[PDB]
Amino acid sequence: YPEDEEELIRKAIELSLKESRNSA
Amino acid sequence: MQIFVKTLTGKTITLEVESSDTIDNVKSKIQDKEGIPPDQQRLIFAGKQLEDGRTLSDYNIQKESTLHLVLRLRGG
């Protein structure tokens, strides 16, 4: 997909969510 | 208050910012230190991109939290 920027943004989104699992 | 900025490449950096101070202020400091335009750089946290016009208090960001860096791709 010609949207490396968008995928990158969500990629980081998921990574962060994993860490903040305990609502923090 | 202090928070670590993590670059997509892989680099965390200490960054002190008042809770009351909005994101715009944070970007300003980041620009002076790292040397990157606020609009270009985009922070992500809690599955939500930080807006350049909202106080940290509302976000309720944890102390010394890591923020994901994301540079907007050039239109060209």
Helix (H) or strand (E) holding B41: strand B41-45
Residue position matching structure tokens 């350049």 = B52
CA pair distance B19, B22, nearest whole angstrom: 8
**B14 three-class SS:** strand
Residue A24 in contact with residue B58, Cβ under 8 Å? no
Q: In chain B, which residues have their Cβ closer than 8 Å to the Cβ of A15? A: 68
Q: Chain A: nearest CA to B17, how far in angstroms?
A: 18
User: What angle is formed at CA B29 by the lines to CA B25 and CA B11, rounded to 5 degrees?
Assistant: 120
Instruction: Count other Cβ atoms within 10 Å, centred on residue B73.
Output: 14
B42 and chain A: CB distance < 8 Å anywhere?
Answer: yes
Domains and CATH numbers, chain B: 1-76 (3.10.20.90)
